[PDB]
């Protein structure tokens, strides 16, 4: 589960730049 | 959901861009 | 405000490591 | 905003736990 | 450059395209 | 302050999101 | 899995630390 | 919090620098 | 192995947040 | 040690708080 | 390039200064 | 201590070295 884990950390990254001032939701659940 | 979706191939930006807000 | 931009992305990983399999909710505005 | 609230002065791992899911 | 455009200011994702290749 | 060094490691990152497979070019001048 | 992508990210992030004033060209390919 | 920031750049430069033989990072003055 | 290399990155990145003011060491070999 | 244990499952704050100093 | 030669065996900063301006 | 010496003015590679175990 440490791959997931490592690629969560640079999602929420790129999303935090992407979505900018709406900000996001970052749910890891299916 | 979007670790499904965007830690088994990469998302664009704007695919990304789906899970704003 | 690059400084809270900085700031923020920051955040989003602390609040990745804290909140764990709950995510979270990043909303800026507040 | 946890920006006023975090980026002003240090939040502790507890009250950055305030939000979470 | 990009560090006097974008260290003071917040660059959009247009703006920091213009440091791509 | 490291500011500018800050604000560079941060600004690498983006870029390498931003700019894809054509990469990018960092200066800090 | 998108190794190859978060690989490249840790790469930019050890040049811009080990790269100097005139900074560096990141093209993957 | 700039030293905060500071220092979460501070121990990724350092992992890097350091490679196996690793690092002590303390805030410690 | 930069899969281990990878993982270390991060694995500082949340020693420096979870351990504060204590400080740790890090001795990646053990 | 850290390596170990921690890139091999997933370790929560509390397991990498055991290796602070 | 640097992708090839760095991700599967670990580039000393030595090796990757040698893709510096 | 490490913040005093490389926070206020960037640290060189050597300097950064002295932390290494
Ligand atoms: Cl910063
Ligand atoms: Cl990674
Ligand atoms: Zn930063
Ligand atoms: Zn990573």
Redesign the interface.
Known sequence: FVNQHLCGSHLVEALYLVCGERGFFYTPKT | ????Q????????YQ??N???
Do not use: A, K, P
């Open positions: 959901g979007i670790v499904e965007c830690c088994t191939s990469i998302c664009s930006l990304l861009e899970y704003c807000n």
